Amino acid sequence: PARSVRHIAIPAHRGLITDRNGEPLAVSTPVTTLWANPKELMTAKERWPQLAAALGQDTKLFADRIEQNAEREFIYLVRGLTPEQGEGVIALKVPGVYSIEEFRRFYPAGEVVAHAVGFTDVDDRGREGIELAFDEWLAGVPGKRQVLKDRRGRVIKDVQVTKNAKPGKTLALSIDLRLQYLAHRELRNALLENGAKAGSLVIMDVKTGEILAMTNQPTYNPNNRRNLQPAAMRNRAMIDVFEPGSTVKPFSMSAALASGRWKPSDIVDVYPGTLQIGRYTIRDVSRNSRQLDLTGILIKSSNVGISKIAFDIGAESIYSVMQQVGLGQDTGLGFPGERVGNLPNHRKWPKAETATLAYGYGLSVTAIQLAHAYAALANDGKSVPLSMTRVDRVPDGVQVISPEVASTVQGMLQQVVEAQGGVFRAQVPGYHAAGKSGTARKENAYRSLFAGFAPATDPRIAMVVVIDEPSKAGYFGGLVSAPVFSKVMAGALRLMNVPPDNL
Ligand SMILES: *[B@@]1([O])O[C]([C]C([O])=O)[C][C][C]1[N]C(=O)[C]C1=[C][C]=[C]S1
Fold first, then answer.
1. Spacing, Cα 22 to ligand 1 middle (Å)
2. Is residue 229 in some structural domain?
3. Which residues, in sequence order, are CB contacts of 484 under 8 Å at separation 6+?
4. One domain, residues 483 and 495
5. 482: which of 71, 131, 385, 425 fits an S-S bond (Cβ 3.0–4.6 Å)?
6. How far apart are the first and last CA of the chain?
7. Residues 358, 55: Cα–Cα separation, whole Å
8. Cβ(422) to ligand 1 under 6 A?
9. CB atoms within 10 A of CB 60
10. Domain of 434?
């Protein structure tokens, strides 16, 4: 062709990601894709070796590259490059060589908030995390310019900007970067001190459904993905599922206290620390108990004790409460890869299955779902829908546990933390805190769990700590996960200026 008119799209400035307070988490930065028309390059061949030397490329490899695709009017010398480099090569004055301002994501907080934020690909398109989930919102409208081109394809003149580019829109996350840094630091230190393989920490606003912090280990630097494992990129809080074990006994207890058949001072005999359901044997971890009250059952995490309560009230009431607090249910966060886990239902709940559900096995949940459950319980039985985006207008919650029952369970979990034989390492200096330890087995390999909230008497914050496969001789949730809860809850309450309730 003697001439032709071609589409070139005006790229959009991709929307700024901030934290709830406007700290920048993902920032669109000027770069420049050095490109070339081979057809024009093919008539300045003595200029190539210098060009190559400034693209650092091998002289003969470069020249082979330009040769093979001589016909094409387009080739990328580099993708991205500062508006600095890009000029250093423009000032060469090589025929068929140009620079064109692009946008590249920078992530100022780096590894600290990688799983939540995720990242864009070579093309400034969301690929993981918030970047993908909210791509539409963040990506603007590419505009369009009609350009007249000579025989070779060199832009002679620009005819019209027919439709300008529209910038993408700012997104403010629920994340509080200050809590996120603290959670990140303490989860990393807890892994080191226990030689654990992995972990997750979630902090929630029990009043707004906002995720204030979501950190996992291992993590990666999104600014430098060069050499990086598939494992280190798992948002484990959202896309990994586990058996919550003893951390859902409190929901089994909500059911019990809602049935009308149980009150806290009621007694269950759990002797001799085991119980046969035909060929199946329920085993307590500790087996030096006969009579325990309902608080003791939680303090001892007695599987026998919670199974006998379950046989009494029925699996249906237990299933119903766990369903309503959202365990194994769709959170509606539309996070890429986000799991729903499994809350298995039954027409006929047999005995074995009644017991396993009640003591926290046979179901699988995310750390985010468990945090959300603990939020509902902390917010006086009222579940607010989860959000990763800042909540200005808090939606109506659903009352999923009676306020009075919620209040009783709150008081019992405060005792689990504060009473003799309790999870004393979960205590939070000059606050009342409430919560529940858990330990799962997966050749002994543990998952170590703590879920709780504070302040105990007027809750603000729900927190889950999950440490995968601690390596020292301590593996119990109350040993491994509780101290991280203590430290990160104490920090979060201070940072949000929450009044101490233990004076
Ligand atoms: B539960 O998940 O966690 C309890 C321990 C805690 O509160 O930290 C013990 C009972 C439940 N776990 C199990 O029964 C499975 C295990 C077997 C041996 C140690 S954990």
1. 41
2. no
3. 186, 187, 190, 201, 450, 465, 467
4. yes
5. 425
6. 85
7. 64
8. no
9. 11
10. 175-221+417-503
